[model samples]
Target: LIELDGDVNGHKGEGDATIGKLSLKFIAPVPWPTLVTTLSAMPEGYVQERTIYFKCDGTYKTRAEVKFEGDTLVNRIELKGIDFKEDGNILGHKLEYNFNSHKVYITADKQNNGIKANFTIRHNVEDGSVQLDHYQQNTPIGDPDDHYLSTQTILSKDLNEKRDHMVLLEYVTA
Candidate 1:
């Protein structure tokens, strides 16, 4: 399981809809070496069997499954009883950790129907920002642009080492 720490918040929407965390647990039938070699080895992409589980507030929120058929890889993401049609894929993924920055690029399903994703995480960097750009269409239910969703999370810690682990409200415009 890979755990990332941060606070995400939403602000505005230009058009219609798009909505959008991260305690990640990897459940795989594939070996570690094979998986690492496949993903970590850049210049090329590999398709293998793996299921990633996500958690929040002690709840198992949603999941994404990756499978291969011959040479083709597919992705399906779902959360039971939450959004409508529930599932989608990864169009592109790129990871770079160089001299100045560490960033990851993932082109996946839309950030609506209540899904949390990371466009790129800049690890241990000072003065960085997190941006979620939603390119959502009239997607499927699992990806339902259902209720004109947009959320903003505010995470902060006081000088006394106390923090607000929270996400704040909605200003919906559909």
Candidate 2:
């Protein structure tokens, strides 16, 4: 499984009405020959999988997985347990890293909730992470006090253990 190193802390609402469950959906396009030619030769249904290591709420260290759907050729990251819900909260900071010329897609389901996500990306000394870009959005969570969903992207090499991956998060309702 692919692994990424980082720290993530998130919260939603408060008290009895607090919102739980956050999801991140990742979409990857078919590999282009000019980019990663080996992938172009793979048979249909071949999947690539990876996991991420992050701290939730400061102390809860959690690991999430990203898997490929042969039918759609997309990788998604999500968490489990009772906190897991079809619809959930969202993360404020959106970060991504691309390798192999594959397109990465992600999204979080609101499900009538508000969220504040705090996260950071960490990589090794020789990871070749470059071309950092950032974008900002207003009222992305559709809730008051929780504003902006700005994101950044880092470009890196294929097969890098540090996938610079994406995430699909899930939270618990209070």
Candidate 3:
């Protein structure tokens, strides 16, 4: 859980104001060593697993991993799940995401060398309500510049009423 500390009315530098807070539950199994090794190879930052739990369901759970490099500090993140499917038109695959202090969840799911994602952003307001401001699902075709079956849109407020602010996403690989 990412908790914001400070007041709710203060402006930047004028005073302290609680911007937002985020809490995430990891119920899926993850390969920590492999994930950290891959993230560490990035020139910008290195990621580390912080906590691990064995659930009653017979699967491992990892939580609140940290990432740092030089002066950069990533407060919270997790490697949710990874898999490759070969039964359909989709091909190779890789998917992972992180929760930043800004109260946003960014996920990257790539298949057949194409990428589709669902990004969730939350605000500090406490009204038992949230928003799904954007959503996009796309597939790249021949060249890096060419794409197909690309669907993008801002979900209507009515749709938001049908669900929480959380972004629900699913993809298949082949």
Candidate 4:
């Protein structure tokens, strides 16, 4: 789950922002490989969660959550949180982050069973300026069933300084 907490009072192009909270979870049939073997080896578990908070005008915090199951590979992820608005309008949106661009793969092990994974990316855009945020996660599926990996990413180009660029990685399991 992911959450954002801060004052959204300034115009879209000028003001401070914050990402208060974020989290993730993964469920598989087999044990997740150790970090030593995986490219960006995360911890072992059935679920993982991450959170981030903004204190200064440009400062931010980040947290991560993960969970691993047996050896088989079933992935599930959930992201949830709240946002603050000065205009009284409730503003909140969630984007999907993809890892395929970074050459991330999800395949089953020696077994022929296919691998399964799920993920979610959440955030909010305030003011009149556009905010650029990114999130990435990777998993390897070695098995043999026919499966297509999905990819999701966000991109924006803003000439004004009021716009901010942010990237966040939610959750992954393989």
Off by over 4 Å in 4: 1-43, 46-49, 54-64, 71-83, 86-128, 132-174
Expressed as tens digits, the lDDT of each residue in 45-125 for candidate 4 is 333323322111121112223333453233343333234332321232322222222222443433422233222222233
Q: Please report, as a residue range, the 10-residue window in candidate 1 with the lowest summed lDDT.
A: 4-13
The per-model lDDT (C-alpha) reads: 0.23, 0.25, 0.25, 0.27
Q: Model 2 Cα displacement at 167 (Å)?
A: 15
What is the alpha-carbon lDDT for the whole of candidate 2?
0.25
Best by TM-score: 4
Top candidate (lDDT): 4
Point out where model 3 deviates above 4 Å.
1-18, 21-43, 61-165, 168-174
- The collision pairs in model 2 are 2-50, 20-171, 20-172, 21-171, 22-169, 22-170, 22-171, 23-169, 24-168, 24-169
Q: 1 or 2: which has the higher lDDT?
A: 2
Per residue, candidate 1 scores C-alpha lDDT tens digits across 37-100 of 1122111322222222211101112334434435433344432211111121110112111112
lDDT by residue for model 3 (22-124), tens? 2221222222122221122223322233221111111112233233335444434433321222321112112122211222122344454433433332322
The TM-score values for the models, in the order shown, are: 0.18, 0.18, 0.17, 0.22
RMSD of each: 18.6, 19.3, 21.1, 17.0
Clashes of each: 9, 10, 5, 49
**Segments of candidate 1 deviating more than 4 angstroms:** 1-145, 162-174
What are the per-residue Cα lDDT tens digits for candidate 2 across 1-174?
A: 222233323221011113533333222321111111111212222222222222231122233322333533232222211221122111312223233222222232255232223333332212343211111111221113433333332333445435443343323321
